[PDB]
């Protein structure tokens, strides 16, 4: 199956998934995340090769698909498989508000398993590092460098590359406070 | 600059200016449509490196921008240069005001032109040959696949596994009228 096809299908279903979602604080779709993440982790296999590339591309694109929609897991893994539905299982804190796991189990849990989904979170986490919204006060901006710093250290591990293009995102993100 | 940056930009861009853009006849936002190119394009790099690979990844966010939202070709050449404007106004049948080129002056243009505009083109009617939109008749359908196979015959030289995955769509495209 062609790396695009494997997109298209996981693009489609959070496409649907994420229907009523904007960007929080945005008029613009939560869509546009998934867009920035999922050309991320392709724009890293350039840079050091992934293995199961497709199904990791997937997982960037659903990777917000049980925190945030009426997605089940068991829908996850009929439609992309085991190693899809596990990534997303691990990428997410809660399924819905539910048991939120706290950061140091979620990372340390990201670092012990599959290092492709420790790539994916890298890569969430370098598109999060756009400019802040206006919204956020001084601190709560530093909470959010300092957390990025955490996921840098936990996970920078999974792929060379993709851990210096955070380091370098991070170092930027310093001017926004 | 980084090809995840290059994205980012043109995808920010593309999504403020299709804001209240939908696919035919679904209510998701347009901007399924051109993640679904973007990723083609980036994808197709992994089959045969494309030159200015960063520039054609934007010209295949904002090929549309020009036929269906308010974007100038001014702003295009200021925030992106000259080779991504160029790029959206060769593959724009009409820039919102001015005549519709025809399809023969408009695939002869693309064929005489930059490679990688063609290749742009190839990327938009592979992800245009998914199942077709639920309103459309037998000859519509038929007209539609008809097209696509001149698209092929004029834009296949610009790609050479690219070319190869349009054959397979038009091919799959028959089963549906
Ligand atoms: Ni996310
Ligand atoms: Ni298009």
Same mark, same amino acid.
């Given at each position: ?19 009523? @979602?904007? *960007?929080?604080?945005? &008029?613009?779709? $939560? ?10 982790? +392709? ?64 990372? @340390?849990? *990201?670092?012990?398993? &599959?290092?492709? $989904? ?10 999060? +590092? ?25 996970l920078g591990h999974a ?19």
């Amino acid at each position: 199956t062609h790396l695009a096809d494997h997109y298209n299908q996981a693009w489609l279903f959070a496409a649907r998934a994420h229907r009523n @979602q904007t *960007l929080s604080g945005s &008029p613009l779709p $939560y869509l546009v995340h998934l867009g920035m993440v999922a050309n991320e982790l +392709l724009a890293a296999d350039r840079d050091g090769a992934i293995e199961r590339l497709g199904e990791t591309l997937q997982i960037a694109v659903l990777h917000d698909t049980l925190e945030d929609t009426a997605t089940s897991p068991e829908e996850l893994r009929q439609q992309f498989g085991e190693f899809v539905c596990a990534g997303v299982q691990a990428l997410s804190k809660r399924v819905g508000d539910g048991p939120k796991r706290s950061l140091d189990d979620y990372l @340390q849990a *990201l670092a012990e398993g &599959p290092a492709q $989904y420790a790539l994916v979170k890298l890569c969430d986490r370098i598109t999060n +590092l756009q400019p802040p919204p206006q919204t956020w006060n001084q601190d709560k901006i530093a909470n959010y460098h300092q957390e990025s710093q955490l996921i840098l250290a936990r996970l920078g591990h999974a792929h060379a590359a993709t851990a210096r293009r955070l380091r370098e995102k991070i170092e930027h993100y310093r001017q926004y406070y």
